[PDB]
Design a protein around this nucleic acid. Structure first.
Length: 139
RNA sequence: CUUUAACAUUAAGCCCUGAAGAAGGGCAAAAAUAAACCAGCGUGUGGC
C-alpha cells in the first residue's frame, strides 16, 4: 500500500536520529548535513521532517514512557534500542496516516534489522505494553 | 515475535639422573649476544 520511499525515509530517519543521539549535536545542522550530503532522492522529505520534529519535541516524553520499562533488563540500556523505541512509539502516538499494524510491522523490521538478534523481542514487548496504553483505539 | 545474546582454552618435542607434577642435564630444530663494609736510546764531553 506504500512505496519503498517511505521505508527508505524511515531507515534514514533511524540512522539520523541514532547519529544525533550518539554524536550529541544540534538537530538542525546534522539534519541539513544528512539531507544535503546523503542519499535523499528516494527519501520522503515531509515524513523525515515530521518524524524528526516529533522525536525532538518528545525526547522527554518518550524517556518518561521508557522509564517504567527499564527494570528487568539483564544488561543496561543501549542506544539503538532507545532510538527504535522512540521512533516506534512516536509512530504509535500521533501519526494518523500510518496504520497501527503497519507501524508495528515496520518497527519489528527495524528492531530485527538494526537492534540485535535478541533486542527485537524487548522492542516488541515495550510496544505491546505501551501502544494499547497510548492508542486504545489502535489506529 | 511480548521484556539483552555469551562455556570458552586444538601450540611447542625425545631421552637420562632424581622421593615426586622439588630439581639437574643432554639430543631432532632456530631469531640473537647507589651501597652499612678489611685495607727510555742517540749524540757530545770527561775520567779510569
Amino acid at each position: 500500500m506504500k512505496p519503498a520511499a517511505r521505508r527508505r525515509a524511515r531507515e534514514c530517519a533511524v540512522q539520523a536520529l541514532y547519529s544525533w543521539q550518539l554524536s550529541q549535536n544540534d538537530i538542525a545542522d546534522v539534519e541539513y548535513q544528512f539531507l544535503a550530503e546523503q542519499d535523499v532522492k528516494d527519501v520522503d522529505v515531509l515524513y523525515f521532517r515530521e518524524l524528526l520534529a516529533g522525536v525532538a519535541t518528545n525526547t522527554a516524553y518518550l524517556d518518561g514512557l521508557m522509564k517504567p520499562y527499564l527494570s528487568r533488563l539483564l544488561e543496561e540500556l543501549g542506544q539503538v534500542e532507545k532510538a527504535v523505541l522512540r521512533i516506534a512509539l512516536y509512530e504509535l502516538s500521533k501519526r494518523s496516516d500510518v496504520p497501527y499494524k503497519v507501524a508495528i510491522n515496520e518497527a519489528i523490521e527495524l528492531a530485527k534489522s538494526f537492534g540485535a538478534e535478541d533486542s527485537h523481542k524487548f522492542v516488541n514487548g515495550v510496544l505491546d505494553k505501551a501502544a494499547p496504553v497510548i492508542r486504545p483505539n489502535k489506529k
